[PDB]
From a paper:
Human [name], normally the least abundant of the four subclasses of IgG in serum, displays a number of unique biological properties. It can undergo heavy-chain exchange, also known as Fab-arm exchange, leading to the formation of monovalent but bispecific antibodies, and it interacts poorly with FcγRII and FcγRIII, and complement. We report here the high-resolution crystal structures, at 1.9 and 2.35 Å, respectively, of human recombinant and serum-derived [name]-Fc. These structures reveal conformational variability at the CH3–CH3 interface that may promote Fab-arm exchange, and a unique conformation for the FG loop in the CH2 domain that would explain the poor FcγRII, FcγRIII and C1q binding properties of [name] compared with IgG1 and -3.
The sdFc structure was solved using the previously characterised Rea [name] myeloma protein. The Rea [name] oligosaccharide is a 70% G(0) glycoform that was later enzymatically galactosylated to yield a 100% G(2) glycoform. In both chains, a galactose residue attached to the α(1–6) branch forms hydrogen bonds with surrounding protein residues, but the α(1–3) branch galactose residue was disordered. A complex biantennary core was modelled in both structures, and with the exception of chain B of the sdFc structure, a fucose residue, attached to the first N-acetylglucosamine residue covalently bound to Asn297, was also built. On the other hand, in chain B of the sdFc structure, B-factors for residues at the CH3 domain surface, close to the CH3–CH3 interface, are considerably higher than those for the rest of the domain. The Ser400′ side chain points away from Asn390, its hydrogen bonding partner, and other interface residues, including Arg409, are partially disordered. Intriguingly, the high B-factors for residues at the CH3 domain surface, and partial disorder at the CH3 interface in chain B of the sdFc structure, may represent the transition of Arg409 between the two conformations, or may even provide an early snapshot of the dissociation process itself.
Author numbering: 237 to 444
Write the structure that this text describes.
């Protein structure tokens, strides 16, 4: 039969009040002849009705795909409430249910360190600025870079990695022209996480 997948919101969306965290329920392998797909949502057991459901969409393997999107309350997601998507077809009683929630467990605050380029990289045209982020729980987290009050784009961040003590760590690498680093520019690694004061902290880095 069909398959259902339930996806959490983005960490950044849950941590900033101004953004719109959403839980997404995706049904694949729907058949043309299947009666209209229906979605019931529950939040900690209670049915709710603000979900937006998109009309079904043909995939190339001759199946259909259906998505229902539930806007969630930041506080609720962070409080560890359980979102349940229940999926069925208009007429038949059979249904499929899926449940998701934030990771359970004592949250830990991330320590954020900045590392300048290795002296050995200094001979190249571009250098790597490193941001180590360690000791955090849960793994849901967001890392960004900026400079001169404007976002930097040329960075990549590793996935969270599980440490011995059950916390997570990761690295972020911002690549910049040597000429920009030694002119004395300040670069900032920004980290967003539920255990940080105001869900936010920032650590800066320039040539010493």
């Amino acid at each position: 039969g069909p398959s259902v997948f339930l996806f959490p919101p983005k960490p950044k969306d849950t941590l900033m009040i101004s953004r719109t965290p959403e839980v997404t329920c995706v049904v694949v392998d729907v058949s043309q002849e299947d009666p209209e797909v229906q979605f019931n949502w529950y939040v900690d057991g209670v049915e709710v009705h603000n979900a937006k459901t998109k009309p079904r969409e043909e995939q190339f393997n001759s199946t259909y795909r259906v998505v229902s999107v539930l806007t969630v309350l930041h506080q609720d997601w962070l409080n560890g409430k359980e979102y349940k998507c229940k999926v069925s077809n208009k007429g038949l009683p059979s249904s499929i249910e899926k449940t998701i929630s934030k990771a359970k467990g004592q949250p830990r605050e991330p320590q954020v360190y900045t590392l300048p380029p290795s002296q050995e990289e200094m001979t190249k045209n571009q250098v790597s600025l490193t941001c180590l982020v360690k000791g955090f729980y849960p793994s849901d987290i967001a890392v960004e870079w900026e400079s001169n009050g404007q976002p930097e784009n040329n960075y990549k961040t590793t996935p969270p990695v599980l440490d011995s003590d059950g916390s997570f760590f990761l690295y972020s690498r911002l690549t910049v022209d040597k000429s920009r680093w030694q002119e004395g520019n300040v670069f900032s690694c920004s980290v967003m996480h539920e255990a940080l004061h105001n869900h936010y902290t920032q650590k800066s880095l320039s040539l010493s």
